[PDB]
Design a protein around this ligand. Structure first.
Ligand code: ZN
Lengths: 99, 21
């Protein structure tokens, strides 16, 4: 897979993320973590207070498609930031070899 | 694009994987 081919799949996966985000807002319930697109994959609805695990997306060629990326959803319904930094916490170490 | 695709992913993961841990 080439670089430009990989970018096209990311744009496709980004479009389906906007659909899943526009639809969940059209059918609301409770206070969960809302779907987000972090330029790699589309994080789904997260249960408050739990770690959210997503399979490493198969449209990324260099990913280990048998692993999982992880996020933290707090009981308030917002994705947890990294301690000491203003960035959303995410662990992609299972997906790549250089981590 | 053999290394161009991989080096492009380096940037995504660099600023993606925010757990400095
Ligand atoms: Zn570069």
């Amino acid at each position: 897979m080439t670089k430009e081919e990989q970018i096209f799949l990311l744009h496709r996966a980004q479009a389906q993320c906007e659909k899943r985000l526009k639809e969940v807002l059209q059918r609301p319930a409770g206070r969960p973590c809302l779907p987000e697109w972090d330029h790699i994959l589309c994080w789904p609805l997260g249960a408050p207070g739990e770690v959210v695990a997503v399979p490493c997306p198969d449209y990324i060629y260099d990913f280990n498609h048998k692993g999982h990326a992880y996020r933290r959803c707090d009981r308030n319904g917002s994705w947890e930031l990294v301690p000491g930094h203003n960035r959303t916490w995410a662990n992609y170490s299972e997906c790549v070899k250089f981590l | 694009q053999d290394l161009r695709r991989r080096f492009f992913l380096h940037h995504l993961i660099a600023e993606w994987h925010t757990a400095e841990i």
